[PDB]
Amino acid sequence: AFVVTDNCIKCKYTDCVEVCPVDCFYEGPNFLVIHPDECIDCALCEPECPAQAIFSEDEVPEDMQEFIQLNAELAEVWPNITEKKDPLPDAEDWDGVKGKLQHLER
Numbered sequence: 618a619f620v621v622t623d624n625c626i627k628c629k630y631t632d633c634v635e636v637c638p639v640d641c642f643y644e645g646p647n648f649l650v651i652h653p654d655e656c657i658d659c660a661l662c663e664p665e666c667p668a669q670a671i672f673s674e675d676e677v678p679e680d681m682q683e684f685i686q687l688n689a690e691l692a693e694v695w696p697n698i699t700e701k702k703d704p705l706p707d708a709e710d711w712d713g714v715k716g717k718l719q720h721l722e723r
């Protein structure tokens with residue numbers, strides 16, 4: 618499975634969803650997650666993220682390990698997203714800010 622980590626939060630560019638062959642991204646207010654059962658690990662999304670927030674599960678940084686289980690849990694509750702849309706309004710002010718998990722909205 619590929620995992621969306623911290624830098625997506627409050628950026629949510631959604632470029633990633635274009636390339637997904639199996640449509641396994643699920644949408645929240647200011648973050649996207651990948652559904653781990655559905656992902657086929659084709660890796661096509663992680664060059665597409667502007668925020669470089671997508672990682673192969675086995676490459677998630679040590680200090681972002683929480684995101685693996687978070688993607689798994691929120692994918693079960695959030696709606697599927699299959700079309701790219703506009704980035705959040707202030708997405709590049711937040712692109713690169715560390716510690717954005719405290720801003721996640723359910």
Ligand code: SF4
Binds near residue numbers: 637641651656662
């Ligand atoms: S690795 Fe492939 S299947 Fe998994 S979320 Fe990315 S594009 Fe979709």
Ligand code: F3S
Binds near residue numbers: 634671
């Ligand atoms: S910012 Fe998030 S919405 Fe997709 S393009 Fe990157 S994982």
